[PDB]
């Protein structure tokens, strides 16, 4: 079920403000979010 | 004859303009993508007004 959660969670998170770092020109890293090799790329969401 | 033709054309154009512009108020802000509304723009053309 992990995928079907991740997607949904992201859909809920991106409606809440933006991330100010996205204008810095500095790409974000692919942070692992579990075992088995799942990764996510997103800056911290600061500006609500 | 030419004067009559021009006059009838002007009258019909005004009537259709009024009808379409009145009809325009029959839309209520559809939200499609980033498009927030749709409208009809009817205007007598100057290149033909001359």
């Amino acid at each position: 079920r992990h995928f079907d959660v991740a997607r949904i969670l992201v859909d809920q998170a991106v409606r809440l403000g933006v991330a100010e770092a996205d204008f810095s020109g500095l790409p974000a890293e692919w942070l692992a979010i579990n075992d088995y090799g799942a990764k996510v790329q997103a800056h911290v969401i600061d500006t609500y | 004859s030419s004067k009559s033709v021009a006059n009838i054309i002007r009258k019909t154009i005004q009537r259709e303009q009024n009808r379409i512009r009145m009809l325009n108020q029959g839309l209520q802000a559809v939200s499609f993508g980033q498009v927030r509304g749709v409208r009809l723009n009817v205007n007598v053309r100057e290149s033909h007004a001359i």
Binding site: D22, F23, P27, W30, Q41 | G33, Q34
Partner: protein, 49 residues
């Protein structure tokens, strides 16, 4: 052997993408978002490059 790969695609100052880098997958990359989200714009950027 060892086919070459597109590793990324960077848009700078495009409409809606001030500075955005996408990391193309080795097999499949999937842009996803509602109408107007700017997916055909990303593919246009790729084609233009």
């Amino acid at each position: 052997i060892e086919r070459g790969k597109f590793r990324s695609l960077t848009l700078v100052n495009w409409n809606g993408f001030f500075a955005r880098t996408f990391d193309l997958d080795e097999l499949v990359t999937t842009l996803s978002g509602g109408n107007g989200a700017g997916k055909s714009t990303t593919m246009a950027a790729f084609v233009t490059a």
